Symmetry: C3
Subunit: 114 residues, 3 copies
């Protein structure tokens, strides 16, 4: 599973250890070992949500499996909660795109996960 956050919140407002917290929390939520989890946080972005430049975030979760109706609802609650708590972003100013990747379409270590 790989999680990316793009936000207009400044770098100084991203807490130390946020990347580790995301990693741990995603490991719990997906049931995957932390070793397979990648996280990417991009602050200071030029963005708008509903025309407004108040704090917001655009995110994605790519995962080989562990994607679906109920799971994505649970991920959204978890991830919006973390962004609200740590970055002071309102959940109604967060989008999260979910992608169920085929193993053959994820490259890693000179090969794919197929």
């Amino acid at each position: 599973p790989m999680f990316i956050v793009n936000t207009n919140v400044p770098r100084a407002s991203v807490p130390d250890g946020f990347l580790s917290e995301l990693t741990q929390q995603l490991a719990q939520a997906t049931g995957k070992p932390p070793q397979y989890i990648a996280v990417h946080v991009v602050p200071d972005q030029l963005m708008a949500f509903g025309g407004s430049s108040e704090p917001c975030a655009l995110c994605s979760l790519h995962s080989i499996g562990k994607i679906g109706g109920a799971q994505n609802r649970s991920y959204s609650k978890l991830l919006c909660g973390l962004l609200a708590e740590r970055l002071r972003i309102s959940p109604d100013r967060v989008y999260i795109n979910y992608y169920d990747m085929n193993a053959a379409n994820v490259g890693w270590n000179n090969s794919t996960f197929a």
Copy 2:
């Protein structure tokens, strides 16, 4: 729609009001409420298009519905037009990836749109 532009054009060359203009035009093109539209502009990028580092853009448009052959052609004419007029990027140095997202795969406000 959420619309992201990555470009090697410098930040200073992105005109004031550009995010608002994108938001407004996308609302009319896609027939979606401006309140839901997210836009993200990423200047000063290290990129090449056809091996050249002349001004270029790589973009994406994610939407729940309102994606299709004719609609995408229309969005491209619109979006290339804006990138040409405002950022001085030639339309033939722009790629835009269109994504028709399932509602179950888009998180927002602690849940999904499903």
Copy 3:
């Protein structure tokens, strides 16, 4: 074909000519003329892979066709090889998401590739 790499490796460690090498190697691998290939390298990113922040990369290859189990394995070997050689990133700290795009869902030059 369009290739993006996000990495925590610093800008100064991206060698001169790297965008060209990527362009050229992708032309070879995909069979597509370099004129049709776009590349984007994003250094200095705030990232973790497996919980830690030794050099790592999250990448994507979007392509109209030329995507599949065997082809993706070959792309991964090539691209990991490049990232290892030029950016000194271990192949086992690299993810590459592969996307087979429909021509109608790629905008270019005021239209689509359909």
